[PDB]
Design a protein around this ligand. Structure first.
Ligand SMILES: COCCOc1ccccc1C(=O)O
Lengths: 237, 300
């Protein structure tokens, strides 16, 4: 069934599972035409497929060529997402295939169920959590690989860097969602928090800075302050 | 015109014959139904006065044998039986008719309702949905489950309607996932019509039989099948024109026939709103839309 706060620890058990977020698959800018009508221009997107236990991120880059000459693109984007997730599952060895796929948006349920008919034992589930995975394109190295792509491409990342050497998956996912929520709420301030100290760098093979345990505590507090600050600005509290 | 005599009527019961019904009192001198129109299937159905649980009944065709009803006090129901002795049967009917112990099938001459509801319904197809090969007539009741309902429990007592499932490998060609899910034409035309049913007449016959079992017995699985077969057509972009026009007629008379007060339990809002207002065929069912809009506007 649906995944919520009551069954949250299930994300970190030993049954392989993936979150699939489709919010950055079909990305457009809207603009005026010479005649004063409005048109869209697509930009490259991505499917965000994440194992919350291990941090493995299967970033399938969606190149704008896949939309060429197609109609009803927002509908097609859901089906293309489900096609690519299905292809990913088929590409994995049996013992790496997920037992559950959790979609962050309920509109993905039917497209994914239909593409996964050959896998009747993989449960397709919605979630009641509001997850900030749309903000994945605020992570500079992910945004860069998506924008530079000239063709469809899959790029593998560990979205937790090396954090699991020191903290549990539950804590790593909590840190990830806090960082992404902060980047979604006020991207400029969140990035300023993450880079404010030149002496802390991002390793070539990492996405986030190399903070010590104590610095992560400070950073996490600053991210919570940002989220609360923005909440007060929004609602005049 | 043919006759279904009753040996007797020992328990008070509402008896239906097709769309007609009448009440019989405990031990009333009722000995059957005469003047039944040859050329159609018929259904004789029962709801006991002391226990409205289990509506049940029998589909039959008087061209296939001489049938009568006799109450069984052990199993507690009116049973259809076949009489193989022709002269015995004729002599029974004649005596009961001479003593005017029979009701007459009360068909108005202008009235094509029953033909319109059973146009494509054949006894041979009924006997394949309802499997009891030793009788020429078919028993159905309010509680019988369908093969589909069971998969999701006594298989000898099931309604073997054709399984329709929009999220199944049968309905979705590998590699045509979006296409086949959003446009069910493959599933309708190749899988169902060309493959399983062979032609539209058999498809409509099953659709009509499912409606009738839903209406006369309150059989929930039959209502599910009726709606699924409507939705499969309406959700297909490519349907032969003759089928769309025939479907409009079929549904019109079913909507013409349904008890105004049973609409809440026999009509699926989602299916009907989808079919009339969103589907590919939203503009192909003018007669059905007109009656649905004027008779049941709440549901919509
Ligand atoms: C005996 O049922 C009454 C029919 O009720 C209707 C109401 C509005 C429009 C059409 C009908 C009809 O079936 O002609």
């Amino acid at each position: 069934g649906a995944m919520n706060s009551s069954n949250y620890a299930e994300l970190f058990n030993n049954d392989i599972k993936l979150f699939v977020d489709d919010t950055n698959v079909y990305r457009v800018t809207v603009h005026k035409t010479f005649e004063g009508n409005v048109a869209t221009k697509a930009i490259n997107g991505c499917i965000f497929t994440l194992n919350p236990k291990t941090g493995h991120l299967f970033l399938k880059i969606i190149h704008t060529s896949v939309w060429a000459g197609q109609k009803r693109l927002s509908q097609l984007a859901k089906w293309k997402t489900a096609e690519e997730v299905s292809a990913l599952v088929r590409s994995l060895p049996k013992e790496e295939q997920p037992k559950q796929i959790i979609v962050t948006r309920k509109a993905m349920l039917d497209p994914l169920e239909v593409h996964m008919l050959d896998f009747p034992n993989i449960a397709i589930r919605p979630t009641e959590l509001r997850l900030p995975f749309s903000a994945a394109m605020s992570i500079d190295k992910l945004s860069d690989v998506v924008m530079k792509a000239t063709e469809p491409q899959m790029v593998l990342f560990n979205i937790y860097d090396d954090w699991l050497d020191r903290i549990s998956s539950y804590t790593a996912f909590s840190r990830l969602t806090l960082l992404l929520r902060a980047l979604k709420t006020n991207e400029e301030s969140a990035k300023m928090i993450l880079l404010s100290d030149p002496t802390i760098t991002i390793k070539s093979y990492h996405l986030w800075p190399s903070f010590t345990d104590e610095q992560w505590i400070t950073i996490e507090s600053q991210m919570r302050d940002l989220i609360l600050t923005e909440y007060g600005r929004k609602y005049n509290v | 015109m043919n006759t279904v005599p009753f040996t007797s009527a020992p328990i008070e019961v509402t008896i239906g014959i097709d769309q007609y019904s009448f009440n019989v009192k405990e031990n009333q001198p009722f000995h059957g139904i005469k003047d039944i129109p040859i050329g159609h299937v018929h259904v004789i159905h029962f709801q006991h006065a002391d226990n409205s649980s289990m509506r049940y009944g029998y589909w039959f065709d008087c061209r296939m044998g001489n049938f009568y009803i006799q109450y069984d006090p052990k199993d507690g129901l009116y049973k259809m039986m076949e009489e193989r002795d022709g002269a015995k049967f004729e002599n029974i009917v004649h005596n009961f008719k001479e003593r005017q112990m029979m009701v007459s099938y009360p068909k108005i001459d202008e009235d094509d309702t029953w033909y319109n509801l059973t146009e494509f319904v054949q006894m041979d197809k009924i006997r394949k949905i309802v499997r009891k090969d030793e009788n020429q007539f078919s028993y159905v009741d309010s509680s019988m489950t369908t093969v589909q309902e069971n998969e999701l429990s006594d298989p000898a007592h099931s309604l073997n309607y054709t399984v329709i499932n929009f999220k199944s490998r049968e309905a979705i060609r590998p590699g045509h996932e979006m296409e086949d899910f959003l446009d069910k034409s493959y599933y309708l035309n190749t899988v169902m019509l060309q493959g399983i049913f062979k032609n539209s007449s058999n498809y409509f016959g099953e659709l009509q039989f499912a409606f009738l079992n839903a209406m006369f017995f309150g059989n929930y699985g039959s209502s599910l099948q009726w709606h699924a077969m409507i939705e499969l057509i309406c959700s297909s972009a490519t349907v032969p024109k003759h089928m769309l026009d025939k479907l409009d007629e079929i549904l019109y008379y079913q909507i013409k026939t349904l008890p105004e007060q049973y609409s809440d339990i026999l009509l699926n809002e989602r299916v009907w709103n989808i079919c009339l207002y969103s589907s590919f065929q939203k503009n192909s069912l003018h007669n059905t839309e007109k009656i649905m809009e004027n008779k049941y506007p709440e549901l919509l």
